[PDB]
């Protein structure tokens, strides 16, 4: 009876949580931003096409200098491109061909990748020998790992498909903190601009806000109806946008603790694979399974443009730190720059 | 208007592209096979008698077979990675009858997957020596688990091995029929199923995978050449 008593107490606390969320709902984001003049039809054209990969591209990441970018593909290679001149700066062969994530360090020295081998491999680019040598392999996850994000040169947050995230210290190799609490495969994560708390979306239609320093889940966000497989912070770190398999994006809010706005259209029935914001925070770009990307007005829920031109499913998407480009990589082994 | 360092960076990029073209020439002529099945299937004793990855060769053709078993039971999220493989090798322990409907449900879940809508399945009905011994024993009947076996007679168009009882042949062709009923009810022309019977000490498995992949690529070539 104690199991049933604690279950009744847990559902009563979920009821009072929903009560506290509905108490603070005084308006709608589509209601306050009625008077804003709209964006207009945006025509972003393809500037560069980067053609070097042999199989489907699964992840990319921009460098912090907004010029170099790393990209990982299922033939078992990372390629580091100079996106201004389309030069291949580096070509790193991987030990396992099944790579599902990619990360470029914010200092430029290191690159991380991982996949179905349950191992986050970390590669040192600036060696004294001229080649890209594997710095170290972090191995403590029991499922495949889905997303990597560097914090420093020495610590990295890893999402995995054994319903858990982790914080690794690379100088040692042992994971310092384990963030348990999900129930499905954690598909993506996104760090705050000050990198002291991050957010994660899993396959149980739930997004959790973890604190990096202490280690507890701070908040939980439950609005979707399928697997959240993309997440990205608003540029001031007080909101985020999730994309799932139910053809909807939506914008959750950290301070009001609830969803603000849904980005969906009735002619869209395929799932979102990738989500990012622009530099000011108005163009929520989202990659879909119908082979193109959509630019949603992040204040009106209006659609404002299409970036078509990929023959296959758009798998990865990213905006530079100066806001001057958008790179989309897809399953037809191509990356494309748009502004 | 390039500089000296810019021209040398372009030359480095060109040599990287040369090595990538050699890697494409190697990668195009190899055959990836997603191997799966249940825990009692004898799935690993097929590939040890012929570990994530495994490479082998039949008539100077390279096969690269990979068993993904390091994760948990939810296969619904990593199986999007293998949607351009050559074939799926599904291994079934066909001697324990109480775990046979689970294998049929798993085969129905794989055959009707939305990422595997163009992937053919090579089906190995493993451990038929135990099936022959359990049928010739007569202590475990198949109509306790599959009652339509009380009404099933073996067809005259079968190919019985030399020495087979009619009872073993009836059991074998009933199990094969139970899988090809699922395989012939969806996706006609997009992908086929190739059912083979296998022992534990059987040695013809690499030749069987070779012949079935030959037929798979022949049908893919008939489709893509506007020729079907």
């Amino acid at each position: 009876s104690e199991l049933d008593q604690l279950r009744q107490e847990a559902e009563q606390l979920k009821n009072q949580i929903r009560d506290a969320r509905k108490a603070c709902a005084d308006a709608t984001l589509s209601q306050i931003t009625n008077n804003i003049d709209p964006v207009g039809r945006i025509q972003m054209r393809t500037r560069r096409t980067l053609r070097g990969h042999l199989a489907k591209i699964y992840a990319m990441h921009w460098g912090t200098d907004s010029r170099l970018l790393v990209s990982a593909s299922q033939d078992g290679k990372l390629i580091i491109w100079d996106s201004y001149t389309t030069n291949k700066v580096h070509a790193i062969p991987l030990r396992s061909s099944w790579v599902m994530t990619c990360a470029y360090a914010p200092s430029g020295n290191y690159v991380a990748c991982g996949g179905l081998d349950n191992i986050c491999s970390i590669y040192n680019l600036k060696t004294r020998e001229g080649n890209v040598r594997v710095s170290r392999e972090l191995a403590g996850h029991t499922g495949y790992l889905s997303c990597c994000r560097f914090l420093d040169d020495n610590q990295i947050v890893t999402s995995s498909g054994d319903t858990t995230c982790a914080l690794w210290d690379i100088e040692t190799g042992q994971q310092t903190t384990t963030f348990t609490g999900h129930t499905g495969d954690v598909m993506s994560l996104s760090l705050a601009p000050d990198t002291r708390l991050f957010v994660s979306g899993a396959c149980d239609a739930s997004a959790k806000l973890w604190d990096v320093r202490e280690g507890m889940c701070r908040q939980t966000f439950t609005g979707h109806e399928s697997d959240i497989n993309a997440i990205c912070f608003f540029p001031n770190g007080n909101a985020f946008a999730t994309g799932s398999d139910d053809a909807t994006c939506r914008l959750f809010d950290l301070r009001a603790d609830q969803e603000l706005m849904t980005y969906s259209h009735d002619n869209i029935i395929c799932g979102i694979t990738s989500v990012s914001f622009s530099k000011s925070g108005r163009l929520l770009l989202a990659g879909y399974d119908d082979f193109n990307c959509n630019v949603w007005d992040a204040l009106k829920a209006d659609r404002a443009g299409v970036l078509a031109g990929h023959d296959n499913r758009v798998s990865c998407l990213g905006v530079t730190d100066d806001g001057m480009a958008v790179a989309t990589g897809s399953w037809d082994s191509f990356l494309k720059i748009w502004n | 208007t390039l500089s000296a360092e810019d021209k040398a960076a372009v030359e480095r990029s060109k040599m990287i592209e040369k090595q990538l073209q050699k890697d494409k020439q190697v990668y195009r002529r190899t055959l990836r096979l997603l191997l799966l099945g249940a825990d009692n299937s004898g799935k690993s004793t097929i590939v040890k008698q012929m570990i994530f990855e495994t490479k082998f060769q039949v008539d100077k053709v390279n096969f690269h077979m990979f068993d993904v078993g390091g994760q948990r039971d939810e296969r619904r999220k990593w199986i999007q990675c293998f949607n351009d493989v050559t074939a799926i090798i599904f291994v079934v322990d066909s001697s324990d009858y109480n775990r046979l409907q689970e294998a049929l449900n798993d085969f129905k879940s794989i055959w009707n997957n939305r990422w595997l809508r163009t992937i053919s399945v090579i089906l190995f009905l493993n451990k038929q020596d135990l099936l022959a011994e359990k049928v010739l024993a007569g202590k475990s009947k198949i109509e306790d688990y599959f009652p339509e076996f009380a009404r099933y007679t073996t067809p005259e168009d079968a190919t019985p091995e030399p020495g087979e009882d009619p009872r073993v042949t009836r059991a074998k062709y009933f199990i094969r029929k139970e899988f090809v009923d699922i395989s012939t009810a969806s996706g006609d022309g997009r992908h086929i199923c190739y059912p083979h019977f296998t022992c534990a000490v059987d040695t013809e498995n690499a030749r069987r995978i070779f012949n079935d992949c030959k037929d798979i690529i022949l049908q893919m070539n008939l489709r893509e050449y506007n020729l079907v």
Partner: single-chain antibody
């Protein structure tokens, strides 16, 4: 450990022939472009040859064009310089230099040991007008190097390199592309300048910072050095 060691020097009669070779132990030799850079017995140092990565590009100075040749052996990890028609102006010391080129790389970073060889025009004129500046330990010294053509390329990079040669050994890359410090240099060196006028500044100069400092342009081939600026106590 990264090292280049060259041999094949010695005394040669004039007009003859001689071969030099540097063996490279400790780095990926097949992806580094290679240079031969020589230095007269009492004068500053000058650039004689360059072979590319994969040998797809070979450049020579005008003095040795036609009578020298340079060739690499990538499995055996060696670089050769075959010299025919030797004059008495080829008495020098020869250095084997590695240099790798991509976006943000550090060319000319490691220099060889040097063979002592004894024998019996629309350029970029790099001008270092000084020859000797007296120093005291714990003072900031500024060394100028004036170009003739503007080294500021249209892509923003200003190709100017500063090397240090201590008394008794091979040069060492201090700064590259007029601002960036090389890996392993103390942070007291700083590179300033614009277009044609450049400055290397040493703050709180120690006793191991003595030698001759060379500036080198990498905007166009041939790569022209400076005359050096000695720093004695």
């Amino acid at each position: 450990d990264v090292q280049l060691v060259e041999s094949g020097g010695g005394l040669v009669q004039p007009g003859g022939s001689r071969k030099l070779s540097c063996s490279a132990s400790g780095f990926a030799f097949s992806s580094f472009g290679m240079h031969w850079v020589r230095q007269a017995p009492e004068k500053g140092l000058e650039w004689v040859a360059y072979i590319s990565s994969g040998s797809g590009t070979i450049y020579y100075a005008d003095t040795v064009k036609g009578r020298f040749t340079i060739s690499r052996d990538d499995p055996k990890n060696t670089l050769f310089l075959q010299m025919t028609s030797l004059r008495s102006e080829d008495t020098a010391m020869y250095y084997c230099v590695r240099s790798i080129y991509y976006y943000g790389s550090s060319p000319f970073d490691f220099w060889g040991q040097g063979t002592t060889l004894t024998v019996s025009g629309s350029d970029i004129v790099m001008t270092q007008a000084t020859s000797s500046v007296p120093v005291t330990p714990g003072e900031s010294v500024s060394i100028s190097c004036r170009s003739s053509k503007s080294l500021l390329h249209s892509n923003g990079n200003t190709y100017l390199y500063w090397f240090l040669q201590r008394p008794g050994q091979s040069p060492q890359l201090l700064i590259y592309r007029m601002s960036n410090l090389a890996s392993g240099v103390p942070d007291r060196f700083s590179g300033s300048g614009s277009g044609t006028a450049f400055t290397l500044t040493i703050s709180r100069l120690e006793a191991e910072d003595v030698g001759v400092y060379y500036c080198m342009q990498h905007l166009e081939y041939p790569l022209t050095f400076g005359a050096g600026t000695k720093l004695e106590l």
